[PDB]
Nucleic acid binder design. Structure first.
Lengths: 62, 61, 110, 108
DNA sequence: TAAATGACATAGGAAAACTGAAAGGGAGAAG
DNA sequence: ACTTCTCCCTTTCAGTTTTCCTATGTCATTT
């Protein structure tokens, strides 16, 4: 009448914990997907601005 | 043969868990680096964007 | 019937060496070893909880007949007592070792 | 000055100026004290008020740089009551999820 | 048939509170 | 005015016990 209920408190918490752990992974998986995608877009813009540095140097130097 | 089957499953669950953990650690390290890589680009774009405007507005136009 | 202090009591169990798996591993009595099998293996006999249990009955926490065994608690209290005993320390944690799990403690002073 | 514990505890009870701290028995024979364990993150000095009151009352916890000490205030309060033969616990709800508390009764 | 793995329910832990029993203050009371 | 008690709560002794979490053993399913 004391120990039997107490195990229940433990399993429910354990279930919350196992489930919560998975969600943290799902949230984690989504982030790697967002980061690679955002990052590639930035590398191109870094290059686009970079192309100009070579381009302006020819235009300005003259 | 009951005891060996249990001993075997258990070693396996451990063999499996260790594998799941390394992947998760492998995923997080990948995660730190992309955010870290993501970080350089936001700044580099900024140095470049100022570099293009400062080089372009003052020196030519 | 004064309450036994844990270190002296643990030491005599060692010297008499009656409980299996419980014994010095360094003949110069400085490092001893305690059976520590996980309380979920079905193939578990008290043999794997003899010290945790003995100390429990020894302090009157576990009075056979009145009480219900509780292997996890016996083990938890035993480990906790040793933990804050500054003058003793783990030295090896073979706890999850497939063939004879155990932990090995060692004495020190400074 | 310099208070005695039983009379002081009783006045705190009559005034009932501190939540969870009151009589639970018309004939003011049994009272109750909030006893939440100081490790639940959902605990900051409101569940430790009487232990706190006694500390200031005996001039122990002078809010001025007397860095709070929940553990100690609680320990000393429990200890003082413990060796007060004529008062005794009667229920230890201390680990109760929703209202941690202990209920003390006077040995009428 | 035998490893892997997903799900559960329990067991194991590090830190820090918490405890009864037992020795300590300390500020008045006694002498 | 100075020493010894006392009365009454504080401390500490020596382990327990909570909290919050993690790690395993054992199925039931997959692969």
């Amino acid at each position: 009448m004391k120990a039997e209920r107490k195990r229940m408190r433990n399993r429910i918490a354990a279930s919350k914990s196992r489930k919560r752990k998975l969600e943290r992974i799902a949230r984690l998986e989504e982030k790697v997907k967002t980061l690679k995608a955002q990052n590639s877009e930035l590398a191109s813009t870094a290059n686009m601005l970079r192309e100009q540095v070579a381009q302006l140097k020819q235009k300005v130097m003259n | 043969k009951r005891r060996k089957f249990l001993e075997r499953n258990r070693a396996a669950a451990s063999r499996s868990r260790q594998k799941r953990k390394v992947w998760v650690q492998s995923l997080e390290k990948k995660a730190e680096d992309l955010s870290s890589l993501n970080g350089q680009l936001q700044s580099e774009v900024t140095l470049l964007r100022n570099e293009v405007a400062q080089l372009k507005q003052l020196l030519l136009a | 019937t004064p309450k036994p202090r844990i270190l002296p009591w643990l030491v005599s169990q060692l010297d008499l060496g009656q409980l299996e798996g419980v014994a010095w591993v360094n003949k110069s009595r400085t490092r001893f070893r305690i059976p520590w099998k996980h309380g979920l293996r079905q193939d578990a006999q008290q043999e794997d909880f003899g010290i945790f249990q003995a100390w429990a009955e020894a302090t009157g926490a576990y009075v056979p007949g009145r009480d219900k065994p509780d292997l996890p608690t016996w083990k938890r209290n035993f480990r906790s007592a040793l933990n804050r005993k500054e003058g003793l320390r783990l030295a090896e944690d073979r706890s999850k070792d497939p063939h004879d799990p155990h932990k090995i403690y060692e004495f020190v002073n400074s």
